[PDB]
Subunit: 68 residues, 4 copies
Amino acid sequence: MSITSDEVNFLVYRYLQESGFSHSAFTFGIESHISQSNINGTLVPPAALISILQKGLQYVEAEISINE
Amino acid sequence: SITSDEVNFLVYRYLQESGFSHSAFTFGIESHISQSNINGTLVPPAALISILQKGLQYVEAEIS
Amino acid sequence: MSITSDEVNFLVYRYLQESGFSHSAFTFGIESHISQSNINGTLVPPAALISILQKGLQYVEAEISINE
Amino acid sequence: SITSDEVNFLVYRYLQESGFSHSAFTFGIESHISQSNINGTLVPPAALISILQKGLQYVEAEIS
């Protein structure tokens, strides 16, 4: 399920916004050229970066536990 | 379950490694990225990306 | 009437704030170490940078006009 | 009488010349420092400082 640069940038950008990192969000939106990203912001849920990251951890725990 | 500081360091490292100098600078401060208790040594390059990769594999396992 | 680095930094910082340059103000406050400046913000009037700059221009106009 | 864009370019140039990289970057955007109609050539280094210097001489002439 290959992930693109623009995707992670969107997840990060939205994380900065939601966490109240107003100044970082602004700076990152520009540096990452987020305006030029082809992603629909309205279809991205809140805490998305937090959610995937949480699942990423659990997935790795599952890989170790079966071979544990 | 991950914590705010852990997530913050992940995005912070990503920002540095991705060459987002000005974002890295501003976010280091706004986060108070230290003052927090994380050892940079135990977090490898692309860790944010890597954990996200495993997270999409998990989501692809839930719709299956 | 010698002017110091911290002084001009304060004038600029306050200009960014007042003009609504929220993100610049934040970034500059940090870069210029404005927290470490020995200046009393409460005794600095609004549009101070704009005012001095305006007077700076008028002063130069006066220097040219008498020799004009 | 000076204009918003003129003041903005002055502070912008000052930010660059003073090595405030991250401020210069953020302020270039937030200002929309161009999109505005100023020729960099006709504005010398330290122009912000210089005009401020003359402004304090003027204020010192008013209390006198």
